[PDB]
RNA sequence: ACUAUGGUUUUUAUU
RNA sequence: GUAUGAAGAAGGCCUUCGGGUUGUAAAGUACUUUCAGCGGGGAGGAAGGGAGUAAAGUUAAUACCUUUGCUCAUUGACGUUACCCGCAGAAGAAGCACCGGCUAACUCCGUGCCAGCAGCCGCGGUAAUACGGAGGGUGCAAGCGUUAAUCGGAAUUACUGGGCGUAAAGCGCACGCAGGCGGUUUGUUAAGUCAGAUGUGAAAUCCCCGGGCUCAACCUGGGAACUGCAUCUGAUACUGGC
RNA sequence: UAGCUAGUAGGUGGGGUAACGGCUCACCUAGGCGACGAUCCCUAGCUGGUCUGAGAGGAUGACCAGCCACACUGGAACUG
């Protein structure tokens, strides 16, 4: 599935900036960030207690543009060799395809980089694939196919990457466009912003 | 550090001729995230006032749980009145699972690999006390080592 | 109970029936339908509600509840019927489809058309 | 090795043959529990030396009568 | 009347904790006094005598602490009607390896401790820590 | 010494 | 579709009357064809057979019947095909159910015990989050729902693990024909049990780990699960027999 | 549904079969079953699997493996 609306309404009623609508080209950001939603999402909550680990689970499935099911699925695999599934969860996500093309910068936001995935514009060790969940390896080399190298729409999200926060975990190249990903992304470097006590009884109502 | 939980809340039907009464009765436990836990139970008006009367219980009867290697060393069973438990150890993330009358029990003691399940004539107000027993049974490296003699 | 008992054979449990056997483990049939009848609500209500009285494909025949607004229906033209209970419907089990053979029609919707079946305006 | 079972003789007055109680240990296969059954095994036996109550020794080789292959090899005490 | 030789030794341990008592007496067998051995080895019971000839008399010294008494779990976890039986590799742990399984080999009673040093399986017939 | 009865039913959420 | 776009338009809805909101959504303007449509090329499934050329075959080593390397030139239903390269243009692509609580989402107007709503408790008589209308939300998504069949919840069938004074079940009360349970010494039997050798719970597959086609379905290389289990040569500590 | 047998049960002598047995054909006798549910009835292919559950337990044995039974309905005989 996917959304296919205003994408603004996103990071309001997420309470949550997704790089959605911002960029260059507005000024401080334009995205109207802790403005409450509607006329009920601006009054106080009645919390069921459920309700605010609910908020926290939306907070990060939003983020990576990630659907319920499929969350499911990578709170199974993050606790894998005891790896605590409110840390191992967010490597793997931070490890998807469509995050890490977008922190080498060949798009804005990982919506313009699961776009260029799902449309083939995007190879893995040389290969092309459509998989925006894909799992990146340590060691392994992203490019992307000439006819988008041929774009701005690429090498824009490339200018604005020089300007923001430069990931420790992978290297780029911004005149072959061309990216090595190089370990596991790790605590120490990667920063969250939602309460790791809230993510510890999740689907087990 | 300091962990303190609401469990359930109760409001006594009577209506006392004015109207439904505003009496409520709290069920509740303290622990401080790392292994102590203690079960709180009283009664007062209006949920606010309740929950403090019910939590002074929990702050009066606190005790260290005897852990090794951050879970129980066997499966132990509990009895208070109508209610029975059966408590055992499990793996990271694989004791909840149990329920939200379990979950608080162990979450206060920072615990999320113990498995607890509730058994027998339940009583919502008696298996934090069954619960407990079951604790009060646990064994503790406190004699097993000083006792085989000589 | 002993070591000696309770083995050899299982002991007696639950069953379903069916409740709604007339259905013959379906969730809908057809019916013939012969007459509409007017009943009385439980205390609390204040109404009186319509049901029918249909013989199915198999030769049984039930009483059906007619749920949504007004009905023009006929003798031997055919409805289709559903298993579902409104307790508030006396001796009843089942239920009537709107939007199926030649039962009575419904119109003018905007939320929920899946029931009373409501086609949508395009031009 | 072929089996052998062994059982007290019941019934002698045949000219070919003698009756012999089988009493073995037997569970349900799932539920547990081993109990003794009591069950009776008809043998063939053209020596005609066995008593009633004495313990025989008997196989099941081929068959010899209608749903039979029980045949008798020997006595485990003679008791008279 | 009397189907087992131990379904009335157990309880007797058990009993008479609360009043303190240093001794308790019972009829005396083969495997009460198979047992009253290995309770004295792992420290349970302090002493056992045997008195008579033709229907003899056990007597054993009861263990205490300071405030307390020491034998604080005892059980059968097994009964007369339906009786357990393990493998020489699938003998019970008890309490992780704070306590101790009772085993009948085909060398006598022990624990499963010594079942599993000697290679042996058997009937289990007690849980104690 | 001295008696039979009367269908049905109601009133807030909140720190 | 993507980016930009603010007298935050035209039109809706709520409106402690203080003002808020649908919503960057739209128009306006710029950017690009995943996929679909039409066009051009084009992979493997193809061995053996045919022709050349060799042979300590067996005899007669260029018949016939056989044997092993190296070359040429080929056998395609699937297929109007995988895969690759073109052409105009956002162009051809969005619903339906849910919002009283449990169990995710909140209100107004109208109706006023009427008419409808229908897991259960219930909602309906003047702001009804439950009905009709409507705006705003929510879970799914080219699917969405409503019901039905079986399991879980089910200790309400109790192997894991139940209960019997009464609240539900101890025979109304007796004898004992079949069945069961039952000290001690010393032998004996090999059904239950055990050891030494041997085999073994297959393939696919849930669970866990690596490959082949992008993840992967599917197919495959290893584990684990499968609380399992057969034949002999022997033992008699223990139970049941004698 | 608590009762059932009388080729049933134990012996004699023959026939037939690739081979074995009341398989099957003739005489001498009165024995033989049944509650681990016989008698009499009512249903149903079996397993690996698969659906469900933590598993035990339950449903289903049809889509992938492998057996088995059948040929409108029921017979009878030959070939090999």
Redesign the pocket.
């Known amino acids: 599935?996917?959304?296919?609306?205003?994408?603004?309404?996103?990071?309001?009623?997420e309470g949550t900036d997704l790089f959605?609508?911002?960029?260059?080209?507005?000024i401080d950001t334009?995205?109207?960030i802790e403005?409450?939603?509607?006329?009920?999402?601006?009054?106080?909550?009645?919390l069921?207690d459920?309700?605010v680990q609910?908020r926290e689970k939306?907070k990060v499935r939003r983020i990576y543009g990630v659907?319920?099911?499929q969350f499911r699925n990578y709170y199974?695999?993050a606790?894998?060799?005891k790896g605590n599934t409110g840390e191992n969860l967010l490597a793997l996500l931070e490890g998807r395809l469509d995050n890490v093309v977008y922190r080498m910068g060949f798009g804005?936001?990982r919506?313009?980089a699961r776009?260029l995935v799902?449309?083939?514009?995007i190879m893995?060790?040389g290969?092309?694939?459509?998989?925006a969940?894909?799992?990146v390896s340590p060691n392994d080399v992203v490019s992307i196919?000439?006819?988008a190298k041929?774009?701005?729409?690429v090498k824009?999200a490339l200018e604005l990457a020089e300007q923001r926060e430069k990931p420790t975990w992978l290297e780029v190249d911004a005149g072959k466009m061309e990216g090595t990903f190089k370990r596991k992304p790790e605590r120490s470097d990667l920063s969250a912003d939602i309460n790791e006590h809230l993510i510890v009884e999740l689907y087990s109502? | 550090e300091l962990q303190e939980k609401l469990i359930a809340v109760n409001?006594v039907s009577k209506?006392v001729?004015?109207?439904?009464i505003?009496s409520?009765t709290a069920l509740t436990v303290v622990g401080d995230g790392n292994g102590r836990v203690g079960f709180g139970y009283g009664k007062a008006?209006?949920?606010?006032?309740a929950i403090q009367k019910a939590m002074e219980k929990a702050r009066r009867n606190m005790i260290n749980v005897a852990l090794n290697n951050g879970t129980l060393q066997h499966p132990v069973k509990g009895v208070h009145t109508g209610s029975?438990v059966?408590m055992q150890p499990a793996s990271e993330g694989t004791g909840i699972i149990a329920g939200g009358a379990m979950r608080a029990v162990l979450e206060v003691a920072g615990v999320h690999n113990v498995l607890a399940?509730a058994?027998?004539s339940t009583n919502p107000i008696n298996v934090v006390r069954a619960t407990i027993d079951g604790l009060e049974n646990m064994n503790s490296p406190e004699m097993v080592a000083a006792k085989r003699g000589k | 109970?002993?070591v000696?008992?309770?083995?050899?054979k299982?002991?007696?449990?639950?069953?379903?029936?069916?409740?709604?056997?007339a259905?013959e483990?379906?969730?809908?049939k057809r019916g013939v339908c012969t007459r509409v009848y007017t009943t009385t609500?439980?205390?609390?209500?204040?109404?009186?509600?319509?049901v029918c009285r249909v013989r199915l494909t198999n030769g049984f025949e039930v009483t059906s509840?007619?749920?949504?607004?007004?009905h023009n229906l006929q003798e031997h033209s055919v409805i289709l019927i559903?298993?579902?209970?409104?307790?508030?419907?006396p001796g009843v089990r089942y239920?009537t489809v709107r939007g199926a053979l030649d039962c009575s029609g419904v119109k003018?919707?905007?939320?929920?058309?899946?029931?009373?079946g409501?086609k949508?305006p395009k031009a | 090795?072929?089996?052998?079972?062994?059982g007290?003789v019941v019934?002698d007055?045949?000219?070919?043959?003698?009756?012999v109680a089988?009493?073995?240990?037997?569970?349900?296969?799932?539920?547990?529990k081993?109990?003794?059954?009591?069950?009776?095994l008809?043998v063939?036996?053209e020596n005609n030396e066995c008593g009633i109550?004495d313990?025989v020794?008997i196989r099941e080789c081929?068959?010899?009568?209608?749903?039979?292959?029980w045949t008798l090899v020997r006595v485990?005490?003679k008791?008279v | 009347?009397?189907?087992?030789?131990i379904a009335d030794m157990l309880t007797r341990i058990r009993n008479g904790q609360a009043a303190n008592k240093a001794a308790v007496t019972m009829p005396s067998?083969?495997?009460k006094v198979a047992i009253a051995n290995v309770l004295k080895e792992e420290g349970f019971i302090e002493d056992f005598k045997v008195e008579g000839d033709?229907?003899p008399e056990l007597e054993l010294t009861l263990k205490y602490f300071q405030g307390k008494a020491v034998v604080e779990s005892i059980q059968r976890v097994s009964r007369?009607?339906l009786r357990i039986?393990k493998?020489?590799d699938?003998l019970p742990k008890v309490m992780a390896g704070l306590g101790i399984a009772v085993v009948?080999?085909?060398?006598?009673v022990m624990t499963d401790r010594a079942a599993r040093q000697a290679?042996?399986?058997?009937?289990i017939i007690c849980y104690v820590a």
């Not at chain 1, 041929?150 to 729409?153: E, P």
């Not at chain 2, 001729?17 to 439904?20: E, I, Q, S, T, W």
């Not at chain 2, 008006?45 to 006032?49: F, M, N, Y």
């Open positions: 599935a996917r959304y296919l609306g205003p994408k603004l309404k996103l990071s309001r009623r959605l609508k911002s960029g260059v080209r507005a334009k995205c109207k403005q409450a939603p509607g006329q009920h999402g601006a009054r106080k909550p009645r069921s459920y309700g609910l939306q659907l319920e099911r199974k695999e606790a894998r060799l804005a936001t919506a313009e776009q799902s449309h083939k514009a893995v060790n290969r092309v694939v459509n998989i969940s894909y799992q196919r000439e006819k041929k774009q701005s729409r824009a109502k | 409001r209506t001729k004015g109207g439904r505003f409520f008006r209006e949920v606010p006032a029975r059966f399940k058994y027998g | 109970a002993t000696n008992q309770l083995v050899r299982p002991r007696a449990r639950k069953v379903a029936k069916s409740n709604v056997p259905l483990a379906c969730p809908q609500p439980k205390k609390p209500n204040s109404a009186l509600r319509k509840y007619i749920g949504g607004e007004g559903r298993g579902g209970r409104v307790k508030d419907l239920h003018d919707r905007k939320q929920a058309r899946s029931k009373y409501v949508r | 090795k072929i089996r052998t079972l062994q007290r019934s007055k045949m000219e070919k043959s003698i009756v089988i009493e073995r240990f037997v569970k349900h296969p799932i539920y547990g081993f109990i003794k059954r009591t069950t009776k008809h063939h036996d109550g313990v020794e081929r068959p010899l009568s209608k749903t039979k292959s485990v005490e008791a | 009347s009397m189907q087992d030789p067998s083969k495997l033709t229907k007369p009607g039986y493998r020489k699938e009948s080999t085909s060398k006598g290679g042996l399986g058997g009937e």
